[PDB]
Amino acid sequence: GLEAVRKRPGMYIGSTGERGLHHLIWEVVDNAVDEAMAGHATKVRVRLLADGGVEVSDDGRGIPVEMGVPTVDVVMTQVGVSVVNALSTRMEVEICRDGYQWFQTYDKSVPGTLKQGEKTRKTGTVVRFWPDPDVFETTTFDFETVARRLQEQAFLNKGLTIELIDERDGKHRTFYYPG
Amino acid sequence: LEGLEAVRKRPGMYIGSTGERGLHHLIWEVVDNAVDEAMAGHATKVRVRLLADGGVEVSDDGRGIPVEMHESGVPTVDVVMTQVGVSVVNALSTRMEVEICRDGYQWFQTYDKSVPGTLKQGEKTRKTGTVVRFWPDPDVFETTTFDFETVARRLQEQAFLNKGLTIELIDERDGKHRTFYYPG
Ligand SMILES: CO[C@@H]1[C@@H](OC(N)=O)[C@@H](O)[C@H](Oc2ccc3c(O)c(NC(=O)c4ccc(O)c(CC=C(C)C)c4)c(=O)oc3c2C)OC1(C)C
Ligand SMILES: CO[C@@H]1[C@@H](OC(N)=O)[C@@H](O)[C@H](Oc2ccc3c(O)c(NC(=O)c4ccc(O)c(CC=C(C)C)c4)c(=O)oc3c2C)OC1(C)C
Ligand SMILES: [Zn+2]
Ligand SMILES: [Zn+2]
Ligand SMILES: [Zn+2]
Ligand SMILES: [Zn+2]
Ligand SMILES: [Zn+2]
Ligand SMILES: [Zn+2]
C-alpha cells in the first residue's frame, strides 16, 4: 500500500531531496492540467503557501464522488497522487461535482469522512497538501522550477490559463497561449 | 496482474486520457526515471530515441534498476515494472524491454502484455545504467505518434534542472536530433 512508498520513497519519486519534493507538485499540477483536454477546464491556479503547503485548483470535471467507498478515497490511496498523500502530513480535497461542493481530509494518508456541502453549479477540484518534513531534506518549493513547468503546460494546452501565486513573497505569474 | 488490469480498465485515472497527452505520460515517466539518476545515481547522460516503429528507448548511465531478489521472491526489476510509476507504461504497452548494467553484469528482461519474462544474466561489465524500451498499445491510445517538439521541450527543462547532465534526443522516424546540456 502507501506503507511501501514511505519505506522506499526513491522507488516512487527518485529521491527525498528537492527533486523528490518537486515530484509532488509536478503530479498534482499534471492531474489538474489533464482536465483541459479531458474535462473542458479553462483555468488552473497553483499557490505556494508560506507554511510549505501547496494548493492546486482547477475548473475541470471534479474527482468523481459517487460510491461503498467514495472514488476520491480510491484516487488518493491508489493512483499517482496517492504518492503525494503517502509523503504528506495531511491533504485537503475540495470537489465541485454533481451540483454540490464536497470536502475530504487525509491525516497521514488516512481518509476522513467525505462531507457534502453547499449546492453549486461550479465543477472542479482543489488539492492542498503539506509535504512531510521528516521525509524531505528540503521542503522549499522553487518558484522558477514551478514556473518553468507551468509555462510548458500552458504551451501544450492552448487556451488554458495557469496562474502561479507565491504566498511567501506575493510574486505571481500568469501563463497563457491562445489557440 | 490485478493492479495492471486496473490501469487497462480505467486508464484516465492513471494518465488523464487516451489521446496524445495520455500517450506522452508514458515517455514523461520513463524520461523522468532516467533523469532522476543524475541527482541520485551519478548519471552523466540520458539518451531518448523515438523508434521508427512507434516505440521509445530511454538509456542512462545511472545505478541500474536493482536486479537482486526482492522480499516478494522475484527480481526487484519485476517489482518496479509491475508496481511503481513505470508499471503504468508496462500496463499500456504491448511489450517492454529492460537492459540493466549493475552488480558487475549486464541483465535483460522482457514484458509481454506486462507479463515478466525470465531475467537473463549476460556478460560482465564495469558499467552501470538502465535502458528501457516500450511500445504503446494502439488498442489503448487514439494516437501512437510521439511529438518531437513536445519531447524536446521536456528534455530542455530536465537538462536545465540537472546542470552537467547531457540529454540526447534522436528521432529515428526522420533523423532529427537535439543535444541538451547546461554547464555547472
Ligand atoms: C487527482 O484526481 C485526478 C484528476 O485530477 C483533477 N485535478 O481533476 C484528473 O487528473 C483525472 O480525473 C478524471 C479521470 C477520469 C474521469 C472519468 O473517467 C470520468 N467519467 C465517468 O463517467 C466516471 C464517473 C465515476 C467514476 O467513478 C469513474 C471512474 C472510472 C473510470 C475512469 C472508468 C468515471 C469522470 O467523470 O471524471 C474523470 C476524472 C475527473 O484523474 C484523477 C481522478 C485521478
Ligand atoms: C524505473 O526504475 C526507476 C529508476 O529508473 C532508472 N532509469 O534508473 C530510477 O528512477 C529509480 O532508481 C532507483 C531507486 C532507488 C534506488 C535505491 O534505493 C538504491 N539503494 C540500494 O542500496 C538498494 C538496493 C536494492 C534495492 O532493492 C533497493 C530498493 C529498490 C528499488 C529502489 C527499486 C535499494 C539503489 O542502489 O538504486 C536505486 C535506484 C536505481 O527508481 C526506479 C527503480 C523506480
Ligand atoms: Zn522521478
Ligand atoms: Zn538543486
Ligand atoms: Zn465534454
Ligand atoms: Zn496526468
Ligand atoms: Zn552515490
Ligand atoms: Zn556511482
Numbering used by the authors:
A (entry chain B): 22 to 88, 92 to 102, 123 to 213, 245 to 254
B (entry chain A): 20 to 102, 123 to 213, 245 to 254
Study authors write:
Gyrase is a type II topoisomerase and the only enzyme that can catalyse the introduction of negative supercoils into DNA;3,5 it is composed of two subunits, GyrA and GyrB, which form an A2B2 complex in the active enzyme. Gyrase is an essential enzyme in bacteria and has been extensively studied as a target for antibacterial agents;6 gyrase has been described as an effective drug target for the development of new anti-TB agents. Other compounds, such as the aminocoumarins (e.g. novobiocin), inhibit gyrase through targeting the ATPase domains of gyrase and topo IV, located in the N-terminal domain of GyrB (and ParE), thus preventing supercoiling. In addition, we present crystal structures of the GyrB N-terminal ATPase sub-domain from Mycobacterium thermoresistibile bound to one of these compounds (Redx03863) and also to novobiocin, demonstrating that this novel compound class inhibits via a binding pocket and resistance mechanism different from that of novobiocin.
We have investigated gyrase from M. thermoresistibile and found it to be more stable than the M. tuberculosis enzyme. Based on these findings, we successfully co-crystallized a 21 kDa N-terminal sub-domain of M. thermoresistibile GyrB (residues 20–254 with residues 103–122 and 214–244 excluded) with novobiocin and Redx03863. This N-terminal sub-domain had been previously used to determine the novobiocin-binding site in gyrase from other organisms. Superposition of the two mycobacterial novobiocin complexes gave a root mean square deviation (RMSD) value of 0.688 Å, indicating that they are closely similar. Residue Arg141 (Arg136 in E. coli) makes a key contact to the aminocoumarin ring system of novobiocin;39–41 the direct interaction between Arg141 and the aminocoumarin ring system of novobiocin has been crystallographically confirmed, and mutation at this residue leads to resistance to the drug.
